[PDB]
């Protein structure tokens, strides 16, 4: 009774339904976004947070300072403030493996946790996940007591990393020099759209330990004297060494929508290629460069046009800019097709060459300027090198204050390039999220907790204080995220405290009275103890002028209380509510008969809400 | 003077021909067999080969 | 892979016959319709005519300006395609093409130049 | 009663920019099954025809993607999202409301933009 014509049309649409799904799974395999959930970066220039990084930029300082003493070394560079403070505590670490341990395997385990909490993950959830850890460093030498091969081996920086936190997936540390960060990036981009694992984080560290890389570079010639590093400026003359932590924490965009992940940025491509026959083995190649640079269009799915900003290597050496400056004018400079001309940058003009920490220290950069709609701003000193054409007026260095304006998708995109001295380079396309678009007890509060925790009493006390800077610093963040975030985006220790408070000044408030050992109105302190919980009843003495009339809105309160109604009506003459609710012409809460009765009804609600 | 039934034949046939080289390629991505080429050894035993 | 290949054109006075192949290889031959489009030179595609899979009656239709002097043929044993051209005319100078299906012409061949020229 | 189909004669394109050719017709070429009967072909300067589109906006398995077809009733385009040089030829839309088809029609003549 179904024409042979009715039948065939339901086969043909099935099929080509099965074909879209087939085809929308091969792109995923290529090309899915990845998303970036979560960043930490500890860089030179009192630099301990991403947030910083964007003051430091934005106030255009730089970082350049004669090298410290703490280490044992006309001398001067850029330097992380804590390179050596490590919590060996924290991680279950004995003070004599930490001091065996070299510094950079310290500094990626601290700044992976925090790349944890900046996506909102409490890392306990993460053990026995599918995790995988992706490292760029390269061996430098701190042990020139015992636990000193561990401490000192590249793969354990990774591998140290997946057992303190309990991770499965893959662990890799990888050299590929300047460029290796953006390699373990690279990789890590792979290893997820390969479902080798499901989260990843992927990022580089270096410090400066050893006494070579400094006076090695010194007799190479390649320094400057300023330490400062001066790119795509008439006054390049070396760069300034640089040290840091730079980590971020990668996830299937599809997955961290279905999550309800906040995204910071995706990778929409990358590539990775080799200088291969050039000038010689540190020589840069402005063709290697083109190719890498089009290759990460092919992969993103866009065209140098889509691009309004790059993030450049910029080391300030004479004549390494204007063979990067020369790629990118053959590459973004052409067929900009009134999109403005590409702003360039490099962060190094800041913080040095974070060696291979520089790539995705560029990326944090990046995704700073994403949230904010505004151009990453870089020093810019003195005047643009004569050695470079920037006659077509399509390249301008980013000098201040820009807003970053979207392509024809109106996706606001960034470019970012990592060159290697071995000839292995990267450039990394990275795009603004996407738009996100997606039940309460105790409904109406008017005021909010703050929970906070800590191994210690007095990381419990800093984090009270350091959340008040924070708060002071950005009023006008909705009390109901800081809330949600302290409470569920964050893992909670046995030390802990909780401020109530209505406005962010009341919450700064409190909380530098916890900061402080302070016994103050609106704020709680104790220790977590396992052990269970015991509920308590007590006899005659609670009743009070309608007692908690105020809860007789939250709906399992007032549920509860319903059905005492019910059964104390038909029992005695009088209900509950009448007694506690304005009591017209009830039962006097001074007979026996009634305030046992509605105490009892209290109670059993209150268990219920509790 | 081709028939319904003949011409909606031939797009379905072409549907599941593209279905079947996509979930080709799908296989191709996720798991195509790497061949190894070549191969050289120098390892202790005097082993040079 | 799917190939589709030509033979058996060339140079032939008018009024003479010739008869085009086009053999098959890497799919079910038999389960296709197979028709032949031709070019002459500098101008379009120009429908010839095709037959039916043998599931559809193996059966032939032509264009006017070539039924009854042209016929089409199959052998699904050798999975092969005939053009038999009679009576040429130089109006039947062009490259034939065979091509895979009669209403969706989803794979061709390389073609083959008739030349009718005395 | 028969129907016709027709497109921009020739399309000057430039390599790295998007191009588009429309097809229109003179009567609706929706099936009751929900799919237009129009396919799009490709003949490469002395080269072979190719199937580049089927049912108006299916790819065919190694077409290159920067094709896509779209359109419904009568009124459909072919677009290629970046033209490569290796794209002149002529395109072809053909309809198979009503067949045999005696031609191709004259097709769309693409070379390249100067």
């Known amino acids: 009774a179904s024409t042979d014509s009715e039948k065939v049309a339901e086969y043909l649409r099935r099929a080509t339904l099965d074909l879209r799904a087939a085809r929308q799974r091969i792109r995923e395999l290529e090309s899915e976004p990845i998303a970036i959930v979560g960043m930490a970066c500890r860089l030179p220039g009192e630099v301990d947070s991403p947030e910083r990084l964007w003051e430091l930029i934005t106030s255009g300082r730089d970082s350049a300072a004669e090298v410290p003493d703490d280490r044992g070394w006309r001398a001067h560079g850029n330097f992380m403030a804590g390179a050596g403070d490590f919590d060996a505590a924290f991680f279950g670490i004995s003070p004599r493996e930490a001091l065996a341990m070299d510094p950079q395997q310290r500094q990626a385990l601290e700044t992976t946790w925090e790349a944890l909490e900046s996506a909102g993950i409490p890392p306990e959830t993460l053990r026995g996940s599918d995790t995988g850890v992706f490292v760029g460093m390269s061996h430098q030498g701190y042990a020139t007591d015992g636990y000193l091969l561990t401490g000192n081996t590249a793969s354990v920086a990774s591998g140290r990393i997946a057992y303190v936190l309990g991770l499965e997936g893959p662990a890799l540390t990888v050299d590929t020099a300047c460029s290796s960060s953006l390699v373990a990036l690279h990789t890590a981009c792979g290893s997820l759209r390969d479902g080798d694992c499901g989260l990843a984080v992927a990022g580089g560290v270096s410090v400066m330990a050893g006494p070579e890389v400094f006076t090695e570079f010194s007799r190479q010639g390649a320094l400057s004297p300023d330490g400062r590093c001066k790119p795509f400026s008439d006054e390049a003359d070396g760069f300034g060494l640089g040290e840091g932590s730079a980590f971020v924490v990668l996830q299937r965009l599809s997955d961290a929508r279905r999550e309800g992940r906040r995204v910071l940025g995706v990778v929409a491509g990358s590539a990775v290629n080799q200088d291969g026959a050039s000038n010689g083995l540190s020589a840069p190649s402005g063709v290697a460069q083109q190719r890498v640079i089009r290759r990460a269009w092919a992969r993103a799915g866009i065209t140098g046009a889509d691009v309004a900003v790059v993030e450049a290597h910029g080391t300030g050496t004479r004549l390494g800019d204007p063979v990067e400056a020369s790629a990118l004018l053959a590459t973004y400079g052409k067929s900009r097709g009134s999109s403005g001309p590409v702003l360039l940058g490099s962060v190094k003009s800041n913080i040095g060459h974070a060696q291979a920490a520089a790539g995705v220290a560029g990326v944090i950069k990046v995704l700073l300027g994403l949230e904010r709609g505004v151009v990453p701003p870089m020093l810019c000193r003195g005047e643009r090198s004569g050695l470079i054409d920037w006659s077509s007026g399509e390249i301008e260095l980013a000098d201040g204050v820009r807003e970053w304006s979207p392509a024809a998708d109106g996706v606001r995109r960034a470019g970012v390039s990592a060159f290697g001295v071995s000839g292995t380079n990267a450039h990394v396309i990275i795009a603004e999220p996407p738009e996100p678009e997606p039940r309460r007890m105790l409904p109406a509060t008017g005021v909010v907790p703050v929970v906070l925790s800590a191994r210690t009493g007095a990381a419990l006390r800093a984090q009270a204080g350091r959340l008040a800077d924070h708060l002071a610093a950005h009023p006008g963040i909705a009390p109901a995220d800081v809330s949600w975030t302290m409470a569920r985006a964050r893992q909670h220790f046995e030390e802990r405290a909780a401020v109530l408070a209505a406005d962010t000044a009341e919450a700064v408030h409190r909380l530098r009275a916890v900061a402080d050992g302070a016994v103050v109105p609106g704020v709680v302190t104790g220790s977590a103890s396992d052990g269970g919980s015991v509920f308590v009843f007590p006899g005659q003495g609670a009743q009070w002028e309608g007692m908690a009339r105020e809860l007789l809105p939250v709906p399992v309160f007032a549920e509860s209380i319903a059905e005492c109604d019910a059964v104390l009506s038909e029992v005695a003459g009088f209900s509950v509510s009448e007694v506690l609710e304005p009591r017209p012409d009830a039962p006097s809460l001074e007979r026996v008969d009634v305030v046992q009765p509605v105490l009892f009804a209290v109670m059993v609600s209150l268990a219920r809400l509790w | 003077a081709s028939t319904d039934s003949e011409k909606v034949a031939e797009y379905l046939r072409r549907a599941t021909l593209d279905l079947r080289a996509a979930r080709q390629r799908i296989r191709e991505l996720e798991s195509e067999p790497i061949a190894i080429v070549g191969m050289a050894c120098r390892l202790p035993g005097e082993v040079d080969s | 892979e799917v190939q589709l290949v030509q033979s058996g054109g060339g140079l032939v006075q008018p009024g003479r016959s010739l008869r085009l192949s086009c053999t098959a290889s890497?799919?079910?031959?038999?389960?296709?319709?197979m028709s032949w489009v031709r070019q002459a030179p500098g101008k379009g595609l120009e429908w010839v005519g095709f037959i039916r899979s043998k599931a559809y009656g193996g059966t032939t239709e032509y264009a006017a300006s070539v039924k009854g002097r042209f016929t089409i043929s199959r052998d699904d044993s050798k999975s092969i395609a005939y053009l038999q051209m009679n009576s040429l005319k130089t109006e039947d100078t062009a490259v034939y093409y065979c091509?895979?299906?009669?209403?969706?012409?989803?794979?061709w061949g390389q073609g083959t130049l008739v030349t009718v020229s005395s | 009663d028969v129907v016709m189909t027709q497109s921009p004669l020739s399309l000057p394109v430039t390599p790295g920019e998007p191009a588009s050719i429309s097809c229109r017709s003179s009567?609706?070429?929706?099936?009751?099954?929900?799919?237009?009967?129009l396919d799009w072909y490709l003949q490469k300067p002395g080269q072979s025809p190719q199937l580049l589109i089927y049912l108006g906006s299916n790819r065919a398995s190694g077409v290159p993607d920067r094709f896509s077809g779209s359109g419904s009733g009568t009124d459909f385009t072919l677009k290629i999202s970046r033209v490569e040089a290796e794209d002149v030829g002529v395109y072809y839309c053909?309809?198979?409301?009503?067949?045999?088809?005696?031609?191709f029609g004259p097709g769309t003549k693409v070379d390249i933009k100067r």
């Open positions: 890497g799919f079910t031959f038999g389960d296709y319709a």
């Open positions: 091509t895979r299906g009669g209403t969706l012409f989803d794979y």
């Open positions: 053909m309809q198979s409301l009503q067949t045999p088809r005696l031609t």
């Open positions: 009567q609706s070429l929706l099936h009751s099954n929900g799919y237009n009967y």
